Automatic annotation (TrEMBL), chains A, B, C, D:
Native source species: Trypanosoma cruzi (strain CL Brener)
Any one GO BP annotation for this protein: lipid biosynthetic process
Binding sites annotated in the UniProt record for Mg(2+): 44, 47-48
Keywords, comma-separated and alphabetical: Lipid biosynthesis, Lipid metabolism, Membrane, Metal-binding, Transferase, Transmembrane, Transmembrane helix
Gene Ontology annotations for the cellular component aspect, listed alphabetically: endoplasmic reticulum membrane
Pathway the protein takes part in: Terpene metabolism; lanosterol biosynthesis; lanosterol from farnesyl diphosphate: step 1/3
Coiled coil segments of this chain: none
UniProt name for this protein: Squalene synthase
Known cofactor(s): Mg(2+)
Catalytic reaction equation(s): 2 (2E,6E)-farnesyl diphosphate + NADH + H(+) = squalene + 2 diphosphate + NAD(+); 2 (2E,6E)-farnesyl diphosphate + NADPH + H(+) = squalene + 2 diphosphate + NADP(+)
Enzyme Commission numbers on file: 2.5.1.21
EC top class named in words: transferase
Length: 341, 341, 341, 341
């Protein structure tokens, strides 16, 4: 009882974004997700701490899920902020964990290990090909989609048919992750050491050095590359609509819908906007408020995604090289929407 | 002599279009240009012949230019009509070739090779992206722009400054080649096997299978795609003007300008035209007759381009898709033309 | 018996490098390769003589091969010492040449003429763009690759399959030529007039004057450029591996492999080395002695290239400016190798 | 036909041993066996790969046989070189499969799944007892014996009674596998991590640390263990004879007899041979050619197996600590051979 109280607080203190969205879910269901996020957010803390030697991570991370069956475990001064607190007093998480139906214990435990090894694979190398790019997103987000999806089926709140093919689920995750990777470009490169996720298979066509876009002189090629990334992201939209339209439970829907609409809105702002190369673009608090409101039932949300896909395509001219590819990606997306409208 | 006289006889037989504009040329330039054409024409035959195995082409095409240095070489059973004769009696071409100035020879030999190798590149891969489309047009037409431009400087008829930047020279070719690719859609997609040049990046918004455009049922989409192709072509117009505006010699100008005015005329007739998918759209012999008549100096050729670009723009409503796309490209062309009137 | 015997005598004294490797081929094929070299070396003698006006070379070279069928042709007052003897008594060369199979002759003559006009092209212009750098290397090296390959097929020692795509054969030559061009920087620049083969497109990013690299003051940037040159060279390794992997005959293999491993070993020494800007970096005699011994079969030569490539990568830190560009180029190389291990 | 081509090409690059023996087979049957191998070879890749997490294999391998009907499935980061190229381009394999006979398909899918699950079992534990040894060989070899046998009956080539008892079919597979495990002892133990297959129940009687065999100090006790392994494989011989005798179709027999005579030949060499603890014992490439030539019909192959089984015993004395055990296991095989003469 006392433990769950720590989780929801440490949560609300770790991700103000997620914390609000999760409130759309039902209590029992919500709890599982809450712990699930914390389990991953804990793993993400060890991976991110750059003051920790690599071989260490490659050694611990893999078997981080094993500490889920040990209510005595915890980690010392690893990470900073509230994150460092989650590890030092991780005990509370493992507690609430053992009080979850064995059904949820498996999903969380499995997804954890899988994501654990995934991160380790990329601690050795960087993102080169489109394949790499997609694999990374799968490891840090795709699997989350897989996880959440399984929990929906495990709770009976969602038809068992939903777990049959977890492809669209992966798309749900990849979309959000890619949207961020694109949006947080500048920040990623301003850190020391500089983090780069944009696959060379793409940015190389527009430059020899990715730090060149940091300059206002290479803007032309920069923005162009930006649209190249945006396009790559739109490929998932059609599948996002499919996954959303296949949800029956209104509680689960809103929880899965909002994050997607937020991304589309953000993706429409970053698309063909040089501002992405020096500042962090964000959607007005009013827009995100509107999004939260109407994203309660399939129809309203679909017409919202409709607007943002048209708002995105409206931000381009007839003299942009990506003109044709973008329009096609937009049409397909809309197609999928009308398909369910 | 007897060889050179054959070149002209075969030229007038194979090409009833080019052979007419080449007479605007002069006697060494015309001979060189005549030989240069026959060389590329012989190359195109072997490459476009589908009965010929691919591996062969990839082994013989890259060295096709070497034959220019061997007056005994020829080809027996290849191509239809006069084309077969051109290869069977290629001796004459090489015979005459050897009597040209090393300057002219180097241009022809060099360009022939570069083109041959470029062709070999697209023999084992489809034209997927817009970039692919531009590269192809560069290999088979853009390079002809370079060649001729180099022949001008070589002959001393044009200022050496011209060959400094061959970018616009490439635009001259791409404009012609694309216009033909757009105009000869039906003829190409009907051959066996069907020849496609329209880049997927563009036609995939309107259709899954390109053959669908032959069916009147998909006329609506066919026309939209068609207009997307035209917009893609209008991009080169401004540069076409710049190149023609940079020519000083009368002969060279007319020879370079006529084909361009012819293209802009054909383009203004195929644009938003639904007949391009079931017949070959041509200009009246009167329209072209006039073109050959007035395209002898900048000023006249300019107000003709202006006229045709206007006719082209006056063939669309505010209601339909590419309105904005086109009107923008039309203004750029005109604006570029006025900048010289 | 006197003519062919003269060929080797001159060969051994003009090329102390090639003259060694060539002894790996069987007599018949070896004699052909011997003439092929002497012809190219003679062609190289004219182009290299700087005490001879340009318009002279531009007239003679293009029609050099024609002298192959003339048992009395020769040239005097060209080349230093021995090289001069070659041209002075070029009679023997053509005599022994007039006894080589019609197959070989057509190859030597073919490549000769192609290379000749290629040199003439770069006698009036400089190596400005990367395309120029690649084309130049193709004219002086790439062609040697094509040529040698054709001789292998002609001799019947290699399957005719080998000459179906000389793209990698070109990569072979470029890798050697590029390596030497990089290693022999100081040597070439100190000559009067200063010889520069490093493309502006690459070094213009690090300096205004290329002579600045001779001064210890600009040492830093000089090294960065050196690494970019090496990076530009590593692009061919994966292809070099493919070519050697497609060889079946022992003699042909060693003869083709040895020079390659030598280049790689040399490249691993010059990479990120400042000494390159003031002396000739050589590999130990024992190092080459080893290469000659083990480079007799694929697998053996592969692990060497493997060791040398890793040593090259081990000669740097993540701090280095090109680290990433190289890191991925290194993996790309090792991958092709493992692909055959 | 475009996919089946990819198969044979990849097979020759992977199995240079099997690749030849499979050509013996007849057209129709030939294709089936080709796929069947590439299916098990693809599966074998995921297993052999050590860098892959253990939980990945257990979640994937068991469901591998299902990807056969999914004509667009493939894998990327798996296996080194050519084997990696198979999983990545596994498309052709799944297509060439979808075209095979319904009967042929069911069998390949069956053996695959079964074998896959057996591998997952031995992926989480070592080989301790002889039973473990035999069961392991059953999964990676004995099952193939069943597979092929079920393919001979399916094709109709062989009697339908040939599939009632697959015991001998298992012995066929084990004999080959055990002959390799014993022969490749060194090559396996010299990898990181060290691969050990010899059952503890057999080597413990001669050593405490199996690695000791790599040192000449324990050579004497290494040879005894080796001879214990041979006596362990001779058991299957009498059974291998019955199976080969049950065959009737020429093509099927040759394809089944060659590998067996090869194993026995290899066994006669590695028996009581101490060179097994530092190198790879191969059969003279001349002897293997003989085996290939004469193993086309039962009679010839019986006298060869005869010779090799006598060559095995013609290497020991009555003093050896195994004499008795071997001597009789030989006569047990020798008689079983003459029982068909
Ligand atoms: C700076 C000048 C740019 C040079 C670009 C010229 C190359 C354009 C391709 C020439 N072309 C393509 C098709 N045609 C028409 C013909 O194929 P052609 O035999 O060339 O007259 P046909 O008369 O319809 O048989 C002409
Ligand atoms: N290819 C490029 C360089 N080399 C080496 C020589 O130029 P080569 O005589 O052609 O072996 P050198 O013997 O070092 O003068 C060969």
């Amino acid at each position: 009882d006392e433990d769950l109280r720590f989780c929801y607080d440490i949560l609300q203190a770790v991700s103000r974004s997620f914390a609000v969205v999760i409130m759309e879910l039902d209590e029992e269901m919500r709890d599982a997700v809450c712990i699930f996020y914390l389990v991953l957010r804990a793993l993400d803390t060890v991976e991110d701490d750059m003051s920790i030697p690599v071989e260490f991570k490659l050694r611990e991370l893999p078997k981080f899920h094993e500490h889920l069956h040990d209510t005595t475990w915890c980690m010392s001064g690893v990470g900073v902020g509230r994150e460092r607190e989650l590890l030092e007093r991780y005990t509370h998480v493992t507690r609430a964990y053992s009080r979850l139906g064995k059904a949820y214990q498996d999903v969380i435990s499995g997804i954890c290990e899988r994501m654990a090894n995934g991160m380790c694979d990329f601690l050795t190398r960087k993102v080169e090909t489109k394949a790499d790019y997609d694999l990374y997103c799968h490891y840090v987000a795709g699997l989350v989609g897989h996880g959440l999806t399984l929990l929906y089926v495990s709770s009976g709140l969602e038809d068992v048919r939903l777990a049959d093919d977890l492809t669209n689920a992966n798309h749900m995750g990849l979309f959000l992750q890619k949207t961020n990777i694109i949006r947080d470009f500048y920040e990623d490169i301003c850190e020391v050491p500089p983090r780069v996720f944009w696959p060379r298979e793409i940015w190389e066509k527009y430059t020899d050095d990715l730090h060149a876009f940091k300059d206002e002189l290479h803007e032309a090629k920069a923005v162009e590359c930006l649209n190249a990334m945006v396009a790559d992201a739109l490929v998932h939209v059609p599948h996002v609509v499919e996954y959303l339209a296949s949800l029956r439970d209104p509680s689960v829907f809103t929880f899965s819908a909002i994050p997607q609409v937020m991304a589309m809105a953000t993706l429409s702002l970053v698309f063909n906007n040089k501002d992405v190369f020096h500042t962090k673009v964000k959607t007005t608090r009013g827009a995100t408020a509107r999004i939260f409101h109407y994203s309660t039932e399939l129809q309203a949300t679909l017409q919202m995604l409709k607007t943002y896909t048209l708002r995105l395509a409206a931000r381009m001219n007839a003299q942009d090289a990506c003109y044709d590819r973008i329009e096609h990606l937009v049409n397909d997306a809309i197609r999928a929407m009308e398909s369910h409208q």
